[PDB]
Design a protein around this ligand. Structure first.
Ligand SMILES: Nc1ccc2ncccc2c1
Ligand SMILES: Nc1ccc2ncccc2c1
Ligand SMILES: [Cl-]
Ligand SMILES: [Cl-]
Length: 163
């Protein structure tokens, strides 16, 4: 575990993380996809061997000795708000199990279902709160990666509010 487990946020490409493992915002089919998933495919393509997994689950594939945790958030275009919310919480619980099993001291994580799976809605608070529910009982240092400068500010404030 980390000596003093923390949450941090960085505004940069998760493919350039400084953590001991990465969470992919995967699609269920293990396809290269777009956004975070495409960046992860370009950096760790070997990790996409038999990575296909259902919505609400996480599957880890090693790139050399570097673990890539493929986490499949719901596409809110297809799911009801109620069912999507359940699957989004579940995906994060499976990430917490995998991070614990791997025995890593740190993990890089994107906010699941906030991009092309958002169904055109702002889900920063929804997705972050499910991330905290899952990861609060783990002792890994968590580093959240985002792109938008105003999202960085909002994520940073939400972390600081609990400290
Ligand atoms: N500041 C950022 C955040 C995310 C990115 N993703 C890919 C490429 C450049 C990026 C820059
Ligand atoms: N957390 C994020 C958000 C968007 C990105 N786009 C490309 C590559 C990495 C990225 C990480
Ligand atoms: Cl997404
Ligand atoms: Cl963002």
């Amino acid at each position: 575990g980390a000596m003093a487990p923390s949450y941090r946020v960085k505004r940069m490409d998760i493919a350039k993380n400084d953590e001991e493992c990465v969470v992919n915002a995967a699609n269920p089919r293990g396809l290269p996809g777009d956004g975070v998933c495409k960046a992860v495919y370009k950096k760790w393509p070997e990790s996409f061997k038999n990575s296909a997994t259902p919505v609400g689950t996480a599957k880890t594939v090693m790139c050399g000795t570097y673990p890539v945790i493929h986490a499949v958030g719901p596409n809110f275009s297809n799911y009801t708000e109620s069912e999507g919310d359940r699957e989004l919480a579940a995906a994060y619980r499976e990430v917490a199990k995998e991070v614990t099993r791997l025995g890593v001291n740190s993990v890089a994580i994107p906010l699941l279902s906030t991009g092309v799976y958002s169904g055109g809605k702002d889900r920063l608070t929804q997705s972050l709160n499910h991330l905290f529910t899952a990861m609060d009982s783990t002792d890994a240092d968590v580093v959240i990666y985002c792109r938008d400068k105003e999202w960085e500010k909002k994520i940073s404030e939400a972390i600081q509010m609990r400290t």
